[PDB]
Structure formats: C-alpha cells, structure tokens
Design a protein around this ligand. Structure first.
Ligand SMILES: Nc1ncnc2c1ncn2[C@@H]1O[C@H](COP(=O)(O)OP(=O)(O)O)[C@@H](O)[C@H]1O
Ligand SMILES: Nc1ncnc2c1ncn2[C@@H]1O[C@H](COP(=O)(O)OP(=O)(O)O)[C@@H](O)[C@H]1O
Ligand SMILES: [Mg+2]
Lengths: 621, 49
C-alpha cells in the first residue's frame, strides 16, 4: 500500500506533549535514571505513574484513559526517540519499546464483576485470582528463506495484531520460488516472540455470598510470559478490547471481549547499623518486649516467636546431605490465654504466612496432589499449603483436632523439608522448607495440675521430638495479676484512634509515647516501630553467622549434662523426650540469637539464652 | 409473659457492641453471644423467631 499521511495535528501534538513529559531537565523528575536503569538491565519497557501524568498534564491523562491505542502508540514512539537520544546504540537491539501504567485510576478501578461495555477501548485496572494458565508458545514475526537452486535468500515481515484487522493477503508462509524452485526455511535467522494466555477470577472473599463467580481472559505477550501462575492473587492493568471473529457471511452480532495486559502486579541503613551496634543484647531485649503491646506478658512465647522470625541457618555438605534450619513450636494452654491472637499477629507480621486449622485442610490439601489433565492426558502437580509456603510460616490452630494421617504426612516436611510425590507416569521431589506454629487444647478441656503433662498432651514421643519447643500456658487467678489484666484490657478498650471524632461510627525508630497504650510509668522506655522492626528482621534474616569453638564444647557438655540429669530430675516431670534433635535445636537457637544482634560469630551469651529457653520449656513443676 | 431481664438482654443483643481494630493489626469482637438452657416448653424458640 502506497498510501501515506503528511500531517496530523493531534498525533504530532500528543507526541510533543510526551516529549516534554519525559524530559526531566528543569524538573525533579526521575525518568532519566529509570531509562538509564533499563539500559543497564537490558529490559525494554517503562512504568509511568498515571497520577504523575495527571498532575503534570491533566488533558493528556484524560485522553489516555478515555482513548488507549493511539496514545499508547505515541508513548512508544516517544520512548524510542528518547532511547535513541540518550544512547542510540542500545535502541538498535529492539524494534519498539513498551509502556506500563501505575497509580490510582479512581473510577476505572473495576472488579471482574463490574467490567462492562462502557469501559471498552479504555485502560482498566482489575484485581483477581488466577485459575487457568497455558503453555508458552512461540509466534513468528519475521521469516527468512533460502533457495539452493538460485543461491538467493529472502525475508518476509508479519504484522497481525499490530493492525486492527488482517486480510488473507498477509499471514501467508512462502514455500516456492518465482520459478517453482523449492525454498528451505532457515529457523536461525527468523524472529519469534513468546505468547501465553491466562484466566482471572474475582476473589471469593470479595464476591457476594452465595453467587457464582465471574472471570476475564488475559493475553500475555513476550515480556510478561512467566509473571503469573495459577492460584495467585494479582492486579492487572491493561486495555479492554473486542476480538475480531474470522471471516463469514452471517454474524449473530456478539463479539468476544478480551483484556490485553500491559502491567501485571503481585499485590503485597545508618539507623539499623547504629541501633544494632549500640544495643547488642538490648536489640533482642526490646524486640521481645515490644513484640505485641496488645498481648500481656508471656515473655518466653514472645522470645520463641522472635526465634521463628529470625530462624536458623540452612547448611549443605559435600555428600549432598541436608541439615534442617527451621524451628517449630507447640503451645498448649487453658482457654482465653490469647493463643489465637498470637497466631493472628504472626500471620500479619510474617511475609509469607498461611493459616490452616485442624480440620480446615486435609492431608491432600496440605502438601500436594497429582491430577490427570483431560485436555492432553498428561499428569500435572498441584501444590498444597506447605509447598506454597516455601521459606515461610504455616499457622495451625486447633492442632489437636488434626487426624493422625495428616500428621504423618507433615512428618516429611518437618524432618527434611521436602515432599516426595509419585504416581505411575510421573514422580517428583518438591521443596517445602517451612516453619510451623501450632496451638492445641488440653484433652480434659482445662489443664490438670496434678497429672503429668504426658497424660494431658496425649501425643506420641515421635511427634513431640519433631517439634523444637513445647510451651504450657495457664490462667492463674491471682488477684493482682487479674487487676493488671483488667487494667490492660480496659486501657486498650477505652483507646480511640487519633484524628477520629469521639462518638463516631465505623519513620522514627521508637514509637511515640502514648498516655493510655503505654502509661505514665513507661515514660522511661519506648517501643520499636513496626516498620523498622520488619526492616531489621529482614536484614537479620539475610545475615549469615558462624559458630565459634568456644561454645561448641560448652553446648555439648550441657547436652550431656541434661541427658545425665534425666536421672537427677526427680521432683518434676519432663514435657518432651531428649533425643539427638535437642542438640541441633540448641545450635539453631544459638544461631537465631546471633541473628538477633547483627554480628559475624555465635557467642556464649546466645548459647546461654538458648539453654535457658530449653530448661524452661522442657521441664515443669 | 415474664422474662423482662431476658427481653432486655435480647434488646441489648439486637443493638450490639462496638468493634475495635488495633494498631498491631489485632482485632477484638464487638458482638454479643447468648445461651439459653431450659426445660421443654419454656418459650425459647418463639424468642429466637
Ligand atoms: N494476656 C492477655 N492480654 C490481653 N488480652 C488477653 C490475654 N489473654 C486473653 N486475652 C483476651 O481473651 C480473649 C481470648 O480469646 P482467644 O485468643 O480466642 O483464646 P484462645 O485462643 O485461648 O481460645 C482475647 O479476646 C483477648 O482479648
Ligand atoms: N409465657 C408465655 N406466653 C405466651 N405464650 C406462651 C408462653 N409460654 C409458652 N407459650 C406458648 O407455648 C409454645 C412454646 O413452644 P416453644 O416456644 O417452641 O418451646 P421451646 O422454645 O422450649 O421449644 C409457644 O407456641 C407459645 O405460644
Ligand atoms: Mg483459640
């Protein structure tokens, strides 16, 4: 086609507007460093805040939201121009670059249930869960052929979705020469791009109760191929378009609507160094004390939860042997001792946390399963709760109600951290390294003091050895303790959020002091802010300490001392048996304490703290 | 007939308490739970309806 366009006021003006938008010379803009980062990382697309564009140029934002394709084309042209300007050499590699979108879209923030034809041809944002995914497939863009008879090579260009409507003249694969000499395809010189299709469903938590769900279909291009997986909660921003049906005579008048993604999102130094170096022991002291103001007392359980948050060190050797580094805890107590509050707080704070109660999930939904795909006849693996929580936390409330077979299944995860799966036609070893919290009621409803803990717990020695720590909590009815508990509870109850009028319906390292949440006496001390706590926890989890020679003999001698004291402990009973796992638990707790205070080696104080914890947990009066 | 205290308890059940989220992310229940144990024919089901 020889038709060309000479002038177009709108397109030229829009391109000029984007050129001025992405200059960042007389402004505090950052996009220049973003482009330099893209050049450094060999990536070929940019993400631009919609709110930023609206602030700088409201008319362009309005036009882009109301009309997508032409404005996106102008964006891509402007990106090509500026990439050529900054570094023309890098722009040679890729044909055209792409634009992502970000920011608060406002009215266009639309649920899969509320997508309508009113938003067609516009850019929309949607939040959902992923249910179906397809295999990655290549697609031809540029084809190259060679003719052995005449020693000539030719090239053909393809453009199918670049243009809105395609015709039979295009998309034809050449096979013969002008004189019927055969052509040989040369796959090395051709160009291909990847293609994938996914399906998104409205989350069951958001859908109205008792109603069937509604879903949308998404196409993922070459860059965003591997960014999504089934069973995942995502947010997708992209165009909403109609699908051209293939040629025919009579049409019913109903198109197919498909969302074409442009952005896919998985929804989620000096201060730290100074604080750590100055505090050392006070680091873990305050972190244990400031774990959760909403919960009263129970310092040992807070210490244990902090040890889970920091964790041990995974180790590997020459022979391929694996040594576990995770910690596991079981709490048993009387009703209303706030075990479930602790579980919920750990769910909120931990990065990868999944709650799975006793009978809520069975043995199949915990680890994994194998299903025969009807579409192809092959065998596929579906991951369970524990496989999804790799290097994460699984919380199990009402642990006693869980059946025996489920606990035998959990043995594989608790011992080695791997899951072996096999059915005729497929077999695999999946990684499931994880940590477990569990809370179980006593068998008699309330913990009996006179009976030994073995009768009350009612669990076999193997399962007890599987757990690193056992804790027993009691509701002692001391008048002064009850007074303290009532004071704390009513102080929390009377508190109201600042900035909210009374009677209405419904970052510094240390938190600001509060008259009610802290109290007048506590003015001499402060609590650590949640955000800094999370940052410090992440940094500590990164750090890799090493064990010293001073503490190894000390810990070994104390383990031997405990195994000999087994005969000496005559006035009290033992909660858990002492096996070879106890020594690994000692080393693990020592390393966790060494993680608490940023350093390079494990010292004696960490071993002493670990041993104090072990002595407290393993024996009771 | 009778059960003025029971009726007042039902009324304050209907009005209900106030729920309170907390800065730690923990929540506390703002609703009331009642139990009625009794002999047959004590007019319990009618109150529930
Ligand atoms: N140490 C404590 N500090 C503050 N509140 C507590 C404490 N112990 C119990 N509570 C209160 O008692 C209730 C206990 O409920 P729950 O945590 O479900 O008990 P359990 O998990 O033992 O069944 C909570 O609502 C909590 O407010
Ligand atoms: N004090 C009362 N005043 C009026 N009706 C009563 C009274 N006590 C019992 N009744 C009548 O007797 C019946 C009680 O049955 P029901 O309330 O179903 O008993 P329950 O709740 O123990 O199963 C009701 O239909 C009610 O009309
Ligand atoms: Mg509970």
């Amino acid at each position: 086609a020889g038709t060309v366009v000479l002038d177009d006021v709108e397109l030229r003006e829009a391109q000029r507007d984007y050129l001025d938008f992405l200059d960042d010379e007389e402004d505090q803009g950052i996009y220049q460093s973003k482009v330099r980062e893209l050049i450094s990382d060999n990536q070929y697309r940019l993400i631009v805040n919609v709110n930023d564009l609206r602030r700088k140029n409201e008319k362009r934002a309005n036009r882009l939201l109301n009309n997508a394709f032409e404005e996106l084309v102008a964006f891509q042209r402007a990106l090509k121009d500026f990439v050529a300007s900054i570094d023309a050499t890098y722009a040679k590699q890729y044909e055209e670059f792409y634009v992502g979108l970000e920011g608060s879209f406002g009215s266009k923030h639309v649920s899969p249930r509320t997508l309508t034809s009113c938003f067609l041809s516009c850019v929309v944002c949607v939040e959902g869960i992923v249910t179906k995914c397809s295999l990655v497939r290549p697609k031809v863009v540029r084809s190259v052929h060679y003719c052995p008879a005449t020693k000539k090579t030719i090239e053909r260009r393809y453009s199918d979705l670049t243009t809105l409507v395609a015709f039979p003249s295009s998309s034809v694969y050449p096979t013969k020469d002008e004189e019927n000499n055969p052509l040989e395809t040369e796959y090395g010189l051709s160009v291909y791009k990847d293609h994938q299709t996914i399906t998104i469903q409205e989350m069951p938590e958001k859908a109205p109760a008792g109603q069937l769900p509604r879903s949308v279909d998404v196409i993922l291009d070459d860059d965003l191929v591997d960014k999504a997986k089934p069973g995942d909660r995502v947010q997708v921003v992209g165009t909403y378009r109609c699908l051209p049906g293939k040629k025919g005579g009579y049409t019913s008048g109903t198109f197919r609507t498909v969302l074409i993604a442009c952005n896919v999102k998985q929804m989620s130094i000096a201060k730290i160094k100074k604080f750590s170096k100055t505090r050392s022991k006070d680091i873990f002291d305050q972190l244990a004390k400031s774990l959760a103001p909403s919960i009263h007392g129970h310092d040992y359980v807070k210490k244990a939860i902090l040890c889970l948050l920091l964790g041990g060190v995974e180790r590997d050797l020459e022979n391929g042997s694996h040594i576990r580094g995770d910690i596991n805890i079981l709490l048993i107590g009387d009703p209303s001792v706030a075990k479930s509050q602790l579980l919920r707080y750990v769910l909120c704070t931990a990065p990868r946390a999944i709650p799975t109660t006793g009978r809520g999930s069975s043995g199949v939904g915990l680890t994994a399963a194998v299903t025969t795909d009807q579409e192809t006849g092959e065998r596929r693996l579906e991951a369970g709760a524990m496989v999804l929580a790799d290097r994460g936390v699984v919380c199990i409330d009402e642990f006693d109600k869980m059946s025996d077979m489920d606990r035998t299944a959990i043995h594989e995860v608790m011992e080695q951290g791997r899951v072996t799966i096999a059915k005729a036609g497929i077999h695999a070893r999946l990684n499931a390294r994880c940590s477990v919290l569990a809370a179980a009621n006593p068998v008699y409803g309330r913990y009996d003091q006179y009976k030994t803990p073995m009768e009350n717990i009612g669990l076999q020695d193997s399962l007890l050895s599987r757990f690193d720590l056992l804790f027993i909590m009691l509701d002692q009815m001391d008048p002064e303790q009850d007074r303290e508990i009532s004071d704390h509870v009513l102080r929390m109850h009377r508190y109201r959020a600042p900035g909210e009028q009374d009677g209405d319906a419904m970052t510094q390292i240390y938190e600001k002091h509060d008259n009610l949440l802290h109290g007048t006496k506590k003015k001499k001390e402060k609590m650590v802010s949640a955000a800094f706590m999370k940052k410090y926890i992440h940094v500590a989890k990164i750090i890799k300490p090493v064990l010293t020679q001073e503490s190894a003999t000390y810990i070994a001698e104390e383990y031997s001392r405990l195994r000999s004291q087994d005969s000496m402990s005559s006035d009290t009973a033992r909660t858990s048996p002492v096996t070879a796992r106890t020594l690994e638990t000692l080393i693990r707790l020592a390393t966790a304490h060494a993680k608490a205070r940023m350093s390079k080696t494990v010292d004696l104080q960490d071993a002493e703290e670990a041993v104090e914890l072990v002595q407290y947990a393993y024996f009771k009066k | 007939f009778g059960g003025t205290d029971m009726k007042k308890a039902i009324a304050c059940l209907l009005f209900g308490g106030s729920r309170k989220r907390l800065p730690d992310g923990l929540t506390r229940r703002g609703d009331i739970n009642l139990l009625m144990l009794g002999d047959p024919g004590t007019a319990k089901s009618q109150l529930l309806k």
